[PDB]
Amino acid sequence: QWVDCEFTGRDFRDEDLSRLHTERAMFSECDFSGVNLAESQHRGSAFRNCTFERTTLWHSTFAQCSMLGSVFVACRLRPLTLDDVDFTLAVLGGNDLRGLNLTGCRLRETSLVDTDLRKCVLRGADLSGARTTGARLDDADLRGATVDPVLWRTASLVGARVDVDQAVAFAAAHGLCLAGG
Amino acid sequence: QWVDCEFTGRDFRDEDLSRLHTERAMFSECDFSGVNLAESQHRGSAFRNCTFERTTLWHSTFAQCSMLGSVFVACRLRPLTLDDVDFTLAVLGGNDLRGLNLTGCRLRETSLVDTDLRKCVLRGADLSGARTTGARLDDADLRGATVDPVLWRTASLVGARVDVDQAVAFAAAHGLCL
Amino acid sequence: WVDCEFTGRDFRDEDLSRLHTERAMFSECDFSGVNLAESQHRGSAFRNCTFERTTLWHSTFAQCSMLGSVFVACRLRPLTLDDVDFTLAVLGGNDLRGLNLTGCRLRETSLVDTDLRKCVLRGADLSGARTTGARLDDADLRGATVDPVLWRTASLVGARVDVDQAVAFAAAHGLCLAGG
Amino acid sequence: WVDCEFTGRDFRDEDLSRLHTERAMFSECDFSGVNLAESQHRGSAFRNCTFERTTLWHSTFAQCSMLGSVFVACRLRPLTLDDVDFTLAVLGGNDLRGLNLTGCRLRETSLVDTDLRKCVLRGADLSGARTTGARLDDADLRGATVDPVLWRTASLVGARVDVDQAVAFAAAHGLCLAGG
Amino acid sequence: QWVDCEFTGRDFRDEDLSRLHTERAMFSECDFSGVNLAESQHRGSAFRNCTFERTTLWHSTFAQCSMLGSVFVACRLRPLTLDDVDFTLAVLGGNDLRGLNLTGCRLRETSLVDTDLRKCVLRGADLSGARTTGARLDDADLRGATVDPVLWRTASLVGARVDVDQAVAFAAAHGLCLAGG
Amino acid sequence: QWVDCEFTGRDFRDEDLSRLHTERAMFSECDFSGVNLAESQHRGSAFRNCTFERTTLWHSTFAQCSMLGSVFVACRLRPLTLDDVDFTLAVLGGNDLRGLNLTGCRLRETSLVDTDLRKCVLRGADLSGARTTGARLDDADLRGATVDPVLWRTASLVGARVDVDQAVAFAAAHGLCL
């Protein structure tokens, strides 16, 4: 149980931090590649510019946490509990985050290149400036989420759930101009 | 002036009908190919399955007239004033109808292939079952018009103006669910 | 009168109560002061005619044309309009309150100071009508075709409008909804 | 500063360039004239503080609170705001042009004469904010929560709004869409 | 071929007017019960307050015609071609008008009690003041048609096609109040 | 003042916690039945699967708190100030929550049977999978809230305020097609 402590440039490569608990712990540029963080729980922790290469995170809970700038590569992220998680400028490209609930998560400037977000729930998620080339959002629920016109044109969105307002934004991303009655 | 008269199967090829006025005139299977119909005025007439290959109809006026099945090939149709004209089954492929107000006009099963319809006004028109391959609807006013899903996926629509229903159906025609 | 025509004719101050017309085409005829109460008209036209202080209440027009006719201080209510055209007609200052105008062609129609509160204009074409100072308070405008300029000059307190029309209004007031 | 508190403290006219704070809770402290350029803040609060002629450009606030703080003639642009609260903050007369305020809590916020042209307020909560004379020309307001009164007092020339919002605007201007 | 002529109180009961043509013919209070008007064609004709009891009208064409006040009872109306037909105050209760195209037809104050309008196309039809108790509008296309709130509550509308604006009107006919964003 | 402390399986029945303040307090399976919690203030606390039978919580304040699975029976919940409270799996059956602003509150799988929610503000709330049998949402502000089709067919909605999406889904939940 790491509480109210900082860490920087710390190397945790290949260690077993199962069931780990942290509270207001802040890590910067730490490497957790190969680490097993299954069942871990974190409250108000920050993972600024950290590396999670082949990191195991399933069945974990992150509440009010920051993932600013971190790089996730082929991680086991499902299931997982992200309640108020900031993924600003993070890289999740290539990862499989299928069926994960990402409601109210900050995905601003987040890399989602070839990220598998199928059947994900992104209601109200801020996806502004996210790089989504090759991103898979099929059957995802985007209702109320904040998305730029580039997503509405480069993401497979088959069976993806959107609202009327978003129906209009998606149409203008393709050239149509709304005029009504 | 021809009125309350019929004409079936006659060839008017290359004749000059400038300034002609017809009323409740019925023309079935007539060939108006090469005919000059500039300034013509029509009220309640029918041009049923007529051939219109290279005909000049600009500055004309059709009011409550039918073009059921007639075929237009390289015709001069603009400017032109249509006031409730029925284009059911007509062939307008490759013609230029830019700027034509086609408000509340029936275009059911109409062929609009390679048809230039840019800036056209289609408010309230019925295009159910029209063939729109290569159809150009850029900047067209599509408000309140009825259109099949296939249209959204075949016509160029850059700047085409639509209603909430159409914007929604556009996304639908692309698999997004609402 | 049936299947007859009347050009230039001057009917000023005559009494045509309960008059009936079928396909009667009155072109450029005056009807000022005339009393046409309880009259019925079917398929008739009233091309560019004058109606100055003409009484027309409790009347009935079906598949009729008013192409051009001018109306002034006429008593038009109640009135029953069925497929009646008003392309270019001039209704300035007239009082049409309560009239039901569903699907009425009012293209290029004039409506300055025209009072139309509580009117039902569902699906009525006001395309290019002059609506300056027009009174449309509490009127049903749903699915009626109009120009952006009306959304800016007409008093529309309590007027009913549908979602598409709402989009039109916010635009005609400088907001941008075209992409959004 | 990390995990520390500061009540009543008076920082007037100090120089805190490139300053960093993590969970620093400044309650009722003055920062007038202070220079906070290039500063970074994470999870900090600035409860009822004063910022009179405070320089804050090129800064960064993440998961921060500004609950109550007053801002006056401050240089706030460019500024990077991430999950920043402004409940009750006073931004009158300030210039926030170009700032990106997606999902910013601006409830009970004050915005009189506040200049926010071209701002991005997508999903921003302006619930019960005073927006008198507020400048929102060309701003993106889509899916942002607002009160009808703003639709009537804010200049919104070229502001972007979505269909639902259009419905809201035409209403706040007396039209009836509730049934229709 | 009846042209430019009137008729009043005329009794045509049980006669064979097959392939009949009329133009600007006007009938008032005429009885066509039992009449066979198959393949008939009419232009600008009027059938003011007329009786069509068990009348055969299939494969006929009415263009610019008035049916004001007439009573249709168990008629064979399909297929049939109604192009600009006025059915103001007419009674079509009980009739089977399934699959008929009724586009731009005046149905104002029209009785449709137990009228079978399934799979009908009523785009832009004015249905204001129509009495629709027991009316069957399943799979009908009502887009843009003018309808009162009573229809939106007493008509079977399963699979019936309506537009967004009508989606709102139907919701308010049930008590919901639209407010948007 | 209890802070950064846990409480598991304890019975507070009929105690008086008036004006109590808790922070990051975690209560799992605690019975607050009969307890007086008037004026209480909470910040970041969790009441996980707690029993709240006849408890007084009026004039309270819950900020970023969880009510995951807790069960409320004949409780005094109004007025009340909720600021981001998670009601996932909570039982609010038959309680009176009239006028409560529940903006952006999670009500996933929440039981709202015979729950009085008239005039409530639910702008942006998540009701996915809530049980709304006998639920009263008359005049409630439903704008932008997520709701299953089943809700439209079970709750009284007279005057409930909705968005274009909801109005459309209401008609859908009644078989009309758009």
Side-chain angles (χ1 to χ4, degrees):
Chain A
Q1 293 205 60
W2 303 335
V3 179
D4 297 296
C5 55
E6 286 81 284
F7 299 92
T8 307
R10 290 298 306 293
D11 181 15
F12 299 117
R13 278 192 275 70
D14 311 318
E15 308 187 331
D16 201 272
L17 308 171
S18 294
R19 298 192 285 286
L20 173 51
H21 277 37
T22 68
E23 174 151 71
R24 292 184 301 288
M26 322 309 265
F27 309 81
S28 314
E29 281 85 48
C30 291
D31 193 326
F32 296 100
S33 294
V35 171
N36 166 5
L37 276 162
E39 343 285 350
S40 67
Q41 302 181 321
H42 319 267
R43 211 86 205 179
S45 271
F47 295 83
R48 232 141 290 158
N49 297 116
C50 285
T51 314
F52 299 92
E53 213 165 338
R54 298 164 307 115
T55 302
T56 295
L57 282 160
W58 53 27
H59 305 97
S60 325
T61 276
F62 288 93
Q64 288 77 57
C65 288
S66 184
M67 287 301 184
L68 196 84
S70 292
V71 190
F72 293 81
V73 187
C75 292
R76 284 153 156 181
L77 286 334
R78 27 202 293 272
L80 169 66
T81 309
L82 284 4
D83 157 66
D84 283 334
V85 193
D86 197 359
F87 281 94
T88 282
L89 292 161
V91 182
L92 305 158
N95 292 283
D96 161 31
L97 298 66
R98 265 176 323 192
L100 278 187
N101 182 285
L102 298 181
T103 281
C105 262
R106 247 213 160 213
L107 285 159
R108 185 100 126 226
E109 323 243 289
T110 299
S111 180
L112 298 169
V113 176
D114 297 303
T115 292
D116 198 20
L117 298 124
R118 271 129 85 231
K119 295 189 164 190
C120 288
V121 187
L122 292 153
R123 289 197 299 260
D126 177 4
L127 261 40
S128 290
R131 196 178 174 186
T132 56
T133 293
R136 291 157 124 333
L137 284 170
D138 310 277
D139 298 354
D141 198 332
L142 311 175
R143 282 175 307 169
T146 298
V147 327
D148 300 330
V150 56
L151 192 139
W152 293 137
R153 297 194 307 247
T154 63
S156 51
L157 290 163
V158 182
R161 321 186 46 210
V162 304
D163 58 52
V164 189
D165 306 294
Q166 299 176 312
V168 173
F170 169 91
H174 287 83
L176 288 61
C177 270
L178 187 69
Chain B
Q1 286 225 41
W2 298 319
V3 175
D4 286 276
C5 42
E6 292 79 277
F7 292 107
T8 319
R10 54 183 294 173
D11 160 29
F12 294 99
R13 287 208 264 72
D14 312 289
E15 305 185 331
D16 175 73
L17 304 175
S18 283
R19 298 186 293 91
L20 164 71
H21 284 43
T22 76
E23 191 168 70
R24 291 191 293 279
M26 264 67 78
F27 305 90
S28 271
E29 272 105 33
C30 286
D31 182 14
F32 292 98
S33 287
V35 170
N36 169 9
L37 275 154
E39 325 278 26
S40 55
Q41 281 215 303
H42 310 271
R43 191 121 232 144
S45 292
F47 300 80
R48 204 152 293 121
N49 303 102
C50 285
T51 290
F52 286 93
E53 301 190 343
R54 294 167 327 94
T55 312
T56 291
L57 291 178
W58 54 23
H59 295 104
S60 300
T61 303
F62 292 91
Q64 295 73 56
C65 284
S66 180
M67 296 299 194
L68 183 53
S70 281
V71 192
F72 297 89
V73 208
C75 273
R76 304 154 107 204
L77 295 335
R78 47 194 282 292
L80 193 45
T81 301
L82 277 20
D83 178 34
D84 180 34
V85 172
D86 186 355
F87 282 98
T88 289
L89 301 166
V91 179
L92 297 175
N95 288 264
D96 174 47
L97 292 78
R98 279 184 313 208
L100 297 190
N101 182 330
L102 291 148
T103 283
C105 278
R106 258 109 68 214
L107 292 164
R108 316 173 52 64
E109 314 253 278
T110 290
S111 170
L112 298 170
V113 297
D114 297 335
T115 298
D116 196 0
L117 291 112
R118 279 129 95 212
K119 306 202 138 198
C120 287
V121 173
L122 289 147
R123 273 164 91 64
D126 186 9
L127 273 71
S128 311
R131 210 167 286 105
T132 51
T133 296
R136 286 138 105 359
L137 276 149
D138 312 279
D139 291 328
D141 192 348
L142 292 181
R143 284 179 298 189
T146 300
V147 306
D148 307 324
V150 61
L151 180 132
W152 303 125
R153 297 184 301 261
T154 43
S156 67
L157 296 152
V158 186
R161 297 161 72 219
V162 304
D163 59 40
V164 177
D165 254 279
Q166 294 167 335
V168 173
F170 180 83
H174 289 74
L176 295 90
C177 290
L178 317 84
Chain C
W1 304 310
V2 188
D3 292 298
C4 60
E5 285 89 285
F6 298 99
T7 300
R9 284 299 302 298
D10 159 36
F11 300 108
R12 288 183 199 187
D13 309 289
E14 300 183 299
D15 185 274
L16 322 193
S17 299
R18 295 191 297 273
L19 177 63
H20 282 46
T21 56
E22 177 132 72
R23 287 192 293 273
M25 325 319 273
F26 310 86
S27 320
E28 300 75 54
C29 321
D30 196 316
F31 295 96
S32 306
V34 168
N35 159 57
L36 277 164
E38 319 287 0
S39 73
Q40 306 208 300
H41 309 265
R42 195 95 202 191
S44 300
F46 290 57
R47 209 139 287 123
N48 305 79
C49 297
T50 297
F51 292 103
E52 218 241 344
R53 267 123 238 172
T54 306
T55 279
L56 280 153
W57 58 25
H58 293 84
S59 313
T60 306
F61 295 90
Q63 283 84 35
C64 282
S65 187
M66 299 302 245
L67 181 56
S69 297
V70 179
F71 291 74
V72 179
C74 310
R75 311 147 92 193
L76 297 319
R77 29 189 307 247
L79 185 57
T80 280
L81 273 25
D82 175 53
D83 292 325
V84 159
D85 190 335
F86 280 113
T87 288
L88 303 158
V90 181
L91 290 178
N94 273 304
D95 173 39
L96 299 83
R97 274 171 320 186
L99 292 180
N100 179 331
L101 304 179
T102 301
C104 256
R105 250 177 176 183
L106 287 168
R107 303 171 58 74
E108 315 273 294
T109 285
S110 167
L111 296 161
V112 288
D113 242 303
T114 305
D115 175 43
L116 316 86
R117 287 127 68 205
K118 296 196 179 190
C119 287
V120 173
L121 282 149
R122 279 153 86 40
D125 189 4
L126 276 56
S127 251
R130 203 164 313 167
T131 68
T132 283
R135 303 167 105 318
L136 291 165
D137 304 86
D138 277 12
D140 200 323
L141 299 178
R142 284 176 305 184
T145 293
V146 305
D147 302 323
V149 54
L150 183 162
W151 292 127
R152 295 189 298 267
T153 69
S155 67
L156 299 136
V157 193
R160 322 174 60 145
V161 304
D162 68 32
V163 179
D164 279 290
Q165 289 180 299
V167 159
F169 179 81
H173 281 47
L175 290 76
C176 272
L177 292 106
Chain D
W1 304 310
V2 188
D3 292 298
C4 60
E5 285 89 285
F6 298 99
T7 300
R9 284 299 302 298
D10 159 36
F11 300 108
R12 288 183 199 187
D13 309 289
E14 300 183 299
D15 185 274
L16 322 193
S17 299
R18 295 191 297 273
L19 177 63
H20 282 46
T21 56
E22 177 132 72
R23 287 192 293 273
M25 325 319 273
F26 310 86
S27 320
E28 300 75 54
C29 321
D30 196 316
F31 295 96
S32 306
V34 168
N35 159 57
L36 277 164
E38 319 287 0
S39 73
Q40 306 208 300
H41 309 265
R42 195 95 202 191
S44 300
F46 290 57
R47 209 139 287 123
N48 305 79
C49 297
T50 297
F51 292 103
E52 218 241 344
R53 267 123 238 172
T54 306
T55 279
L56 280 153
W57 58 25
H58 293 84
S59 313
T60 306
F61 295 90
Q63 283 84 35
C64 282
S65 187
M66 299 302 245
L67 181 56
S69 297
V70 179
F71 291 74
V72 179
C74 310
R75 311 147 92 193
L76 297 319
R77 29 189 307 247
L79 185 57
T80 280
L81 273 25
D82 175 53
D83 292 325
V84 159
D85 190 335
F86 280 113
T87 288
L88 303 158
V90 181
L91 290 178
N94 273 304
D95 173 39
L96 299 83
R97 274 171 320 186
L99 292 180
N100 179 331
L101 304 179
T102 301
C104 256
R105 250 177 176 183
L106 287 168
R107 303 171 58 74
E108 315 273 294
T109 285
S110 167
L111 296 161
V112 288
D113 242 303
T114 305
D115 175 43
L116 316 86
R117 287 127 68 205
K118 296 196 179 190
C119 287
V120 173
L121 282 149
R122 279 153 86 40
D125 189 4
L126 276 56
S127 251
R130 203 164 313 167
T131 68
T132 283
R135 303 167 105 318
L136 291 165
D137 304 86
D138 277 12
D140 200 323
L141 299 178
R142 284 176 305 184
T145 293
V146 305
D147 302 323
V149 54
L150 183 162
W151 292 127
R152 295 189 298 267
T153 69
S155 67
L156 299 136
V157 193
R160 322 174 60 145
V161 304
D162 68 32
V163 179
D164 279 290
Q165 289 180 299
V167 159
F169 179 81
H173 281 47
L175 290 76
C176 272
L177 292 106
Chain E
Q1 293 205 60
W2 303 335
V3 179
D4 297 296
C5 55
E6 286 81 284
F7 299 92
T8 307
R10 290 298 306 293
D11 181 15
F12 299 117
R13 278 192 275 70
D14 311 318
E15 308 187 331
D16 201 272
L17 308 171
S18 294
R19 298 192 285 286
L20 173 51
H21 277 37
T22 68
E23 174 151 71
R24 292 184 301 288
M26 322 309 265
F27 309 81
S28 314
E29 281 85 48
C30 291
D31 193 326
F32 296 100
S33 294
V35 171
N36 166 5
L37 276 162
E39 343 285 350
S40 67
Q41 302 181 321
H42 319 267
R43 211 86 205 179
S45 271
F47 295 83
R48 232 141 290 158
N49 297 116
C50 285
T51 314
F52 299 92
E53 213 165 338
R54 298 164 307 115
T55 302
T56 295
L57 282 160
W58 53 27
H59 305 97
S60 325
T61 276
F62 288 93
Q64 288 77 57
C65 288
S66 184
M67 287 301 184
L68 196 84
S70 292
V71 190
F72 293 81
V73 187
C75 292
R76 284 153 156 181
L77 286 334
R78 27 202 293 272
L80 169 66
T81 309
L82 284 4
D83 157 66
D84 283 334
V85 193
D86 197 359
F87 281 94
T88 282
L89 292 161
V91 182
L92 305 158
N95 292 283
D96 161 31
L97 298 66
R98 265 176 323 192
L100 278 187
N101 182 286
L102 298 181
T103 281
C105 262
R106 247 213 160 213
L107 285 159
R108 185 100 126 226
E109 323 243 289
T110 299
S111 180
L112 298 169
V113 176
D114 297 303
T115 292
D116 198 20
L117 298 124
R118 271 129 85 231
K119 295 189 164 190
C120 288
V121 187
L122 292 153
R123 289 197 299 260
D126 177 4
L127 261 40
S128 290
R131 196 178 174 186
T132 56
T133 293
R136 291 157 124 333
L137 284 170
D138 310 277
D139 298 354
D141 198 332
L142 311 175
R143 282 175 307 169
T146 298
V147 327
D148 300 330
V150 56
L151 192 139
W152 293 137
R153 297 194 307 247
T154 63
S156 51
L157 290 163
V158 182
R161 321 186 46 210
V162 304
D163 58 52
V164 189
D165 306 294
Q166 299 176 312
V168 173
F170 169 91
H174 287 83
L176 288 61
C177 270
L178 187 69
Chain F
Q1 286 225 41
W2 298 319
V3 175
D4 286 276
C5 42
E6 292 79 277
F7 292 107
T8 319
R10 54 183 294 173
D11 160 29
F12 294 99
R13 287 208 264 72
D14 312 289
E15 305 185 331
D16 175 73
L17 304 175
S18 283
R19 298 186 293 91
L20 164 71
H21 284 43
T22 76
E23 191 168 70
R24 291 191 293 279
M26 264 67 78
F27 305 90
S28 271
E29 272 105 33
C30 286
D31 182 14
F32 292 98
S33 287
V35 170
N36 169 9
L37 275 154
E39 325 278 26
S40 55
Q41 281 215 303
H42 310 271
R43 191 121 232 144
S45 292
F47 300 80
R48 204 152 293 121
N49 303 102
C50 285
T51 290
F52 286 93
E53 301 190 343
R54 294 167 327 94
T55 312
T56 291
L57 291 178
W58 54 23
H59 295 104
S60 300
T61 303
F62 292 91
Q64 295 73 56
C65 284
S66 180
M67 296 299 194
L68 183 53
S70 281
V71 192
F72 297 89
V73 208
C75 273
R76 304 154 107 204
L77 295 335
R78 47 194 282 292
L80 193 45
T81 301
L82 277 20
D83 178 34
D84 180 34
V85 172
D86 186 355
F87 282 98
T88 289
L89 301 166
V91 179
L92 297 175
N95 288 264
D96 174 47
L97 292 78
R98 279 184 313 208
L100 297 190
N101 182 330
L102 291 148
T103 283
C105 278
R106 258 109 68 214
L107 292 164
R108 316 173 52 64
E109 314 253 278
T110 290
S111 170
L112 298 170
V113 297
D114 297 335
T115 298
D116 196 0
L117 291 112
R118 279 129 95 212
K119 306 202 138 198
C120 287
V121 173
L122 289 147
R123 273 164 91 64
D126 186 9
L127 273 71
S128 311
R131 210 167 286 105
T132 51
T133 296
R136 286 138 105 359
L137 276 149
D138 312 279
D139 291 328
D141 192 348
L142 292 181
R143 284 179 298 189
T146 300
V147 306
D148 307 324
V150 61
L151 180 132
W152 303 125
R153 297 184 301 261
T154 43
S156 67
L157 296 152
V158 186
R161 297 161 72 219
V162 304
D163 59 40
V164 177
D165 254 279
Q166 294 167 335
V168 173
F170 180 83
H174 289 74
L176 295 90
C177 290
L178 317 84

